[PDB]
């Protein structure tokens, strides 16, 4: 049983590339950009893009600046999210954090533009910007609806949001990576279902630390349902979830979507990259 | 917003197609409405103005990408991605510089480059995307690049005139009067207005606007003759 391709060190090259672009000691706008970037963390977003690009037969030289783009767009969305680690608006003032987050967004767009010079045909580069933008609108929508849905009961409406919260974030990676790798339409649809399903499983894992409340609210007698609809307040919530096995039921919903994620992957060619994408579903 | 008018004429002056510039303008004004929504915060609801404005940047790039579905050659669209994104970064580096300049006097050439990179790139957003999607060569693009920045400075001073006059009055003032101007940043308006006038700052500012307007009209000459190129000279007319 011999793999036919290499399995590169995908995390270390992305870190070195991001730090190389915004090294210690930058000033001006690069200073605010870097504050958002550092400490780097694992960068599972960028690593995901490179694996998805390589899973379909792509080049690292194309995938690497797209991964940086994905890094910048995500950190800028986080820098703006804090306004609405010490927070950048805390550190520099709220106005500077706005320009900074925009600088991170536009560094994303500029780095994704390098894909042409890196070797990608202009038609794929435009299709990559289309994927990036549409997933960007999904991540923004769910963030807003998260605010308008809070303090009120939603089961499907919660699931849509977390797909646009977590799955669109994964699809920004997988769709741009797959697009830059030259994926055909069946592989891109496979990567999108993988992103949506794994994003759902990821968010429920966060809920488990919310879906349990809705699973608990769903199962409760009407006397308690009217109590949950109305609802120290955390501990009363944890009481009703425990009473109606809300946390266990949430685990069973999440475990079903993990399997639809590993199912979706089997469309991809067998490779060390597909196996890593499967590996990312395990806790 | 001369930007949508600037993008459409800019694409057509080099022989571009209208079927492309019209959706590109939805894309272009999308970005400026986003930039302006963030300018309201730095000076609806705060969440929606931030999150919705971020959304409009993504709207602009997607719409620019749809110019191919409208007929644009993919190669021109990709090069415009670079132009649009770098113009945004220019505004980013300048907007921070403006924040770091308040309450203090600086050199004039600092001010002109500050407003050339902020406001001049705001016009280049229109002109560059238009000409590149219109199919312009590199010498024609630099001419739009000089034309955008020279007019951006000019109209920014015109807004200052309603700041360059304060800097130019400071240049001509003796230190006994230079200091007085410095204290008025860190009722004040009447003290400043009296000073700008006594050293002809406002009149000197108008002549600076005319110089850049000329450079704006100079740079247009490199493009072929057309009403589209004539339209672009009309934007230097301050009644326009």
């Amino acid at each position: 049983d011999v793999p036919q391709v290499a399995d590169p060190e995908v995390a270390a090259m992305v870190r070195a590339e991001v730090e190389g672009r915004w090294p210690l000691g930058v000033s001006g706008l690069d200073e605010v950009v870097r504050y958002g970037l550092v400490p780097f963390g694992k960068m599972m977003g960028p690593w995901l893009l490179i694996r998805s690009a390589l899973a379909v037969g792509g080049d690292i030289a194309t995938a690497l600046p797209a991964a940086v783009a994905l890094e910048c767009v995500q950190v800028g969305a986080m820098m703006h999210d804090d306004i609405i680690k010490p927070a950048a608006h805390t550190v520099f003032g709220e106005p500077t954090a706005i320009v900074g987050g925009d600088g991170l967004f536009f560094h994303g767009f500029a780095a994704l533009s390098e894909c042409r010079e890196a070797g990608a045909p202009a038609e794929r580069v435009a299709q990559a910007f289309t994927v990036l933008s549409r997933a960007g609108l999904r991540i923004g929508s769910a963030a807003l609806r998260e605010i308008r849905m809070s303090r009120e009961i939603c089961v499907q409406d919660y699931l849509d949001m977390i797909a646009d919260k977590s799955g669109a974030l994964l699809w920004m990676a997988c769709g741009v990576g797959g697009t830059l790798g030259g994926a055909d339409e069946a592989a891109l649809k496979a990567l999108s279902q993988y992103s949506d399903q794994l994003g759902i499983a990821y968010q429920i894992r966060d809920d488990l630390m919310t879906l349990p409340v809705l699973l608990a609210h769903e199962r409760a007698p009407r006397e308690q349902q009217l109590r949950i609809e109305r609802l120290e307040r955390y501990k009363a919530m944890a009481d009703l979830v425990g009473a109606y096995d809300g946390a266990q039921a949430a685990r069973e919903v999440s475990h079903r979507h993990v399997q639809l994620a590993t199912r979706a992957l089997q469309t991809l060619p067998p490779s060390p990259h597909r196996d890593a994408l499967e590996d990312l579903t395990v806790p």
Side-chain angles (χ1 to χ4, degrees), chain A residues 208-220:
Chain A
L208 286 168
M209 303 180 92
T210 53
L211 178 56
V213 178
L214 273 52
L215 288 177
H217 171 278
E218 198 176 46
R219 302 174 165 178

Side-chain angles (χ1 to χ4, degrees), chain A residues 114-146:
Chain A
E114 291 169 25
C115 291
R116 176 78 196 105
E117 298 93 314
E123 188 86 340
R124 283 183 190 159
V125 178
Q127 305 177 104
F129 268 95
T130 295
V131 173
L132 176 104
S133 291
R134 283 203 263 187
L137 302 164
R138 266 168 75 193
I139 304 172
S141 51
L144 292 175
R145 318 271 216 276
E146 158 168 20

Side-chain angles (χ1 to χ4, degrees), chain A residues 66-83:
Chain A
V68 167
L70 181 280
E71 162 76 7
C72 296
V73 164
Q74 280 179 345
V75 168
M78 282 172 335
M79 186 179 281
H80 282 180
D81 190 72
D82 291 352
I83 299 177

Side-chain angles (χ1 to χ4, degrees), chain A residues 158-233:
Chain A
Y158 184 73
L159 293 188
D160 300 350
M161 188 282 241
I162 72 175
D164 289 343
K165 200 178 176 215
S166 189
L169 210 58
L170 306 185
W171 172 242
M172 193 179 281
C174 292
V176 168
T179 294
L180 291 172
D184 59 11
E185 67 179 20
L188 285 171
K189 180 183 182 173
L191 284 165
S192 179
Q193 165 98 319
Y194 165 82
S195 299
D196 280 354
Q197 297 296 342
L198 182 58
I200 292 170
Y202 181 98
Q203 187 51 240
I204 304 179
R205 291 153 157 173
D206 174 53
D207 293 2
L208 286 168
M209 303 180 92
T210 53
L211 178 56
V213 178
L214 273 52
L215 288 177
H217 171 278
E218 198 176 46
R219 302 174 165 178
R222 256 178 71 171
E223 310 88 71
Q224 289 84 1
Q225 288 179 349
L226 310 143
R227 166 192 169 174
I228 283 161
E229 293 161 354
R230 187 174 72 221
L231 289 177
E232 188 286 329
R233 300 150 63 60

